[PDB]
């Protein structure tokens, strides 16, 4: 089997991407944030505290003839941005772009933190990291990809995120029309439950490539590119007037600037992030200070190849017995 679904930016900055997902019988379609940095499929629901729902579409398990309470199971998750959610668990039929999994754990939110309530466009998350990170207790549950894998034509999914435009998540096949050149594959460590890999270095604009190993995660659920402070300083030093602002929470730059590109290495190959992809717009409405799309990971504990980086590439998440990642230009 295969599946193919369009993913759409939630706003004009590509802060996140939503993908329609069919849950239950008859189908209830919710727009989920596909997150290769986490491993829970959770949704706003009829069980979510009413004051914490503000415009989202909810899953109502009582209206699904295939929903079954997973007795005794609870979940609770906290994300790198400080947001969180928790609740109980159903199993139900879940389909993405024509690919169907029966018996998928659908984690129903009873509580969500303010940032989720405040984002009316995201109805939940669909985790695509390794199932060892799934938070369901006392019986850990498998991701949608893990459940579908054996049925797929090939044990892979691909992320093709757009810049200010829709893109595609494919399951079970590699669309050879969706990228240019060849796909360069690189080793993955699953020891932390992430799609963790080592970039071979970077360049800023037209500058020379610096060969240096940068361990990080391919994380579709993180907006920005978080890299070591040395690398980020070298990037922003090429932008007149850019500075790190403790009060804003990262590097800002004059909105009048033209940003240089940023290149990262994948083995001997190179992925170029155009400068425009690094502009996240005014820090507040009407400000001439703009927020940068490359930020320091120093306070995180891990480097994160988020959407800023991934949307410059066609990315293969290869879930073979030994997982690997593939990157192509597009």
UniProtKB/Swiss-Prot annotation:
The keyword Protease applies. It comes from the Eukaryota. It catalyses: Hydrolysis of proteins with specificity similar to that of pepsin A, prefers hydrophobic residues at P1 and P1', but does not cleave 14-Ala-|-Leu-15 in the B chain of insulin or Z-Glu-Tyr. Clots milk. Keywords: Aspartyl protease, Disulfide bond, Hydrolase, Protease, Signal, Zymogen. GO terms for biological process: proteolysis. Its EC number is 3.4.23.22. Disulfide bonds join 255-290. One of its GO terms (molecular function) is aspartic-type endopeptidase activity. Residues 17-328 form the Peptidase A1 domain. The keyword Disulfide bond applies. The active site is at residues 35, 199. Belongs to the peptidase A1 family. This is Endothiapepsin. The chain holds residues 90 to 419 of 419 of the full protein.
